[PDB]
């Protein structure tokens, strides 16, 4: 019997229907001449990578794999689904069935067929597949990443890797909008050089290969002129730029207005509407235009239940076809409750797009944001139809958070942040997942002490034990069992972080080594903190003073190092013990 492995995202409807089977050494492939080109290539690569030949002539002893879209006239597929259909599903959905030596994939469309193969790829372990009946489809129909942070833009290879990763997790959107790319913002009028354009072409091609809608962003807000001959000239500049990316295959565009001095709401929206008419609609194979207003968090948009001036005029003028992005109640913020969605959607008489600013860390660069999607309402799909996260300048470790994004936006009402968090790390880290959880667990909360606060609280079960110790100590109860429990946790953080340092691949390790060092320092200072507690209990002053120097030395090292981790837990524990 073959267990269903970890799947991401969680398919909507899955049922085990059999004991499972081993897929034979080579397989009959059916419908691959009519099925989505990209789904077939995904399937082809996976089969090659796992040493599974495709037969030329049908072999009735071989596992048979049938693939195609609803709109393909292929009746051998309908027979293999055994009454399961993708016809009645929403766009991007698919059905998948494995019983009795056959595997059938019917996508509602090509996108759906590709995602069906992605699921197939996750179900197969060492040739063994479970026998199941799936129908699956996304809650939110635009899902992915806006590369829109300040600081060092992702490299070409970062982006190429990211896009393979989106495909494998059914994320369909990638917005190219890095703040520090001069040709995106500071110098938005200027053409990309020929070699930068050749890296774009590779990016566009890999997007299409992976079913990702590549969105070309531009932020002209710095200095765009709106009126007369200058307004024309500057508008023609948007057009030439968008057109040169159109000419390489781009079919989604964004025009952004965040973090700029000019607050001409009508002018902003007028530029959007013009571009929408003269480019987006005229081209006719271009997806809806995307934007972010100069006011983009509820705090900056709304005053005492009512839109501020900029927002109100912007919402009045902006064509209903355009996607408007907002970050929630603040820029970086604990939650988007349903009621916040409802309020903003209301001002806009439309379904909104979320620009979720987590795991981005450009505003507090010493800490890694390595937790799940958190504080996002599970009924958010009522007012949101477009969901993207803003990742860290660290592409590799951004994967943990984004992994949970795939799950939240695909299967929203089923989303369980802690389960999805454990899954992400289980799927990404393999042999090292247990240790990676130990470390990552301390690096989920982002807090700059002023305007930016978001994410699941750092290692909460450990904070709870830390608090039950001070409770048991001040009300003089026997704490000696908690103390031994805590020595274990602290020794474990050190053991785990050392294992990560020894065994993480360069790609991960080059992103988080300073924070591993930081957590070992804190774990060690926590151990001494406990030693300080125990020598206070034992009225032993020689041993208290020297565990106090050690604790002070560790905390001194963590406070002045660049790396930041576990501020309110492992770090605060040492500050607590020194009073």
């Amino acid at each position: 019997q073959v267990l269903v492995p970890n799947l991401n995202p969680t398919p909507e409807n899955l049922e085990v229907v059999g004991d499972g089977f081993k897929i034979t050494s080579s397989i009959n492939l059916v419908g691959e001449e009519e099925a989505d080109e990209n789904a077939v290539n995904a399937l082809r690569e996976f089969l090659t990578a796992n040493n599974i030949e495709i037969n030329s002539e049908n072999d009735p002893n071989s596992t048979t794999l049938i693939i195609g879209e609803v709109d393909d006239d292929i009746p051998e597929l309908d027979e293999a689904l055994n009454g399961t259909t993708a016809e009645n599903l929403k766009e991007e959905g698919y059905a998948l069935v494995s019983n009795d030596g056959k595997i059938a994939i019917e996508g509602k469309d090509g996108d759906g067929t590709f995602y069906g193969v992605q699921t197939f790829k996750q179900l197969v372990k060492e040739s063994n597949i479970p026998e199941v009946n799936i129908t699956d489809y996304p809650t939110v129909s635009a899902r992915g990443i806006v590369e829109g942070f300040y600081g060092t833009p992702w490299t070409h290879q970062d982006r190429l890797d990211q896009i393979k990763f989106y495909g494998e997790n059914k994320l369909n959107t990638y917005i190219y909008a890095p703040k520090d790319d001069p040709y995106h913002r500071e110098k938005w009028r200027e053409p990309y050089p020929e070699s930068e354009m050749q890296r774009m072409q590779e990016l566009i091609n890999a997007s299409a290969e992976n079913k990702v809608d590549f969105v070309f962003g531009i932020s002209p807000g710095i200095d765009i002129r709106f009126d007369g001959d200058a307004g024309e000239e500057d508008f023609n500049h948007l057009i030439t730029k968008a057109e040169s990316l159109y000419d390489m295959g781009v079919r989604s565009f964004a025009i952004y207005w965040d973090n700029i001095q000019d607050k001409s709401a009508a002018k902003h929206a007028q530029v959007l509407n013009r571009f929408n008419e003269e480019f987006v609609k005229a081209k006719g194979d271009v997806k809806p235009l995307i934007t972010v207003p100069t006011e983009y968090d509820t705090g900056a948009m709304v005053s005492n239940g009512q839109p501020r001036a900029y927002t109100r005029i912007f919402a009045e003028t902006v064509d209903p076809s355009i996607e408007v992005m907002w970050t929630g109640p603040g820029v970086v913020t604990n939650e988007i409750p349903l009621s916040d969605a409802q309020l903003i959607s209301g001002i806009y008489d439309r379904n909104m797009a979320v620009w979720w600013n987590y795991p981005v860390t450009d505003y507090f660069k010493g800490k890694l944001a390595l937790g799940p999607m958190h504080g996002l309402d599970k009924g958010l799909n009522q007012y949101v139809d477009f969901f993207t996260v803003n990742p860290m300048e660290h592409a590799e470790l951004s994967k943990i958070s984004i992994h949970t994004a795939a799950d939240y936006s695909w299967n929203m009402d089923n989303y369980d942040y802690d389960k999805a968090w454990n899954r992400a790390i289980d799927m990404l880290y393999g042999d090292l997942a247990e240790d990676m959880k130990v470390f990552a667990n301390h690096s989920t909360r982002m807090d700059n002490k002023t305007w930016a606060k978001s994410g699941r609280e750092d290692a909460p079960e450990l904070r709870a034990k830390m608090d039950e110790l001070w409770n048991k100590l001040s009300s003089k109860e026997d704490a000696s069992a908690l103390i031994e429990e805590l020595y274990g946790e602290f020794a474990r953080m050190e053991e785990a972080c050392n294992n990560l340092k020894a065994n993480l691949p360069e790609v991960a390790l080059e992103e988080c080594s300073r924070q591993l060092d930081e957590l070992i320092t804190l774990a060690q200072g926590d151990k001494a903190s406990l030693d300080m507690i125990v020598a206070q209990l034992n009225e032993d002053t020689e041993a208290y003073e020297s565990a106090k120097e050690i604790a002070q030395n560790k905390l001194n090292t963590a406070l002045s190092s660049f790396a930041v981790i576990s501020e309110k837990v492992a770090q605060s524990f040492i500050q607590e013990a020194l009073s």
């Binding site: 300040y150 703040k179 965040d258 973090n259 001095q261 705090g299 900056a300 820029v331 970086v332 600013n357 450009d362 505003y363 305007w451 930016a452």
Partner: peptide
Amino acid sequence: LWVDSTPP
């Protein structure tokens, strides 16, 4: 001005 989205 503008190295993150610090409010004004």
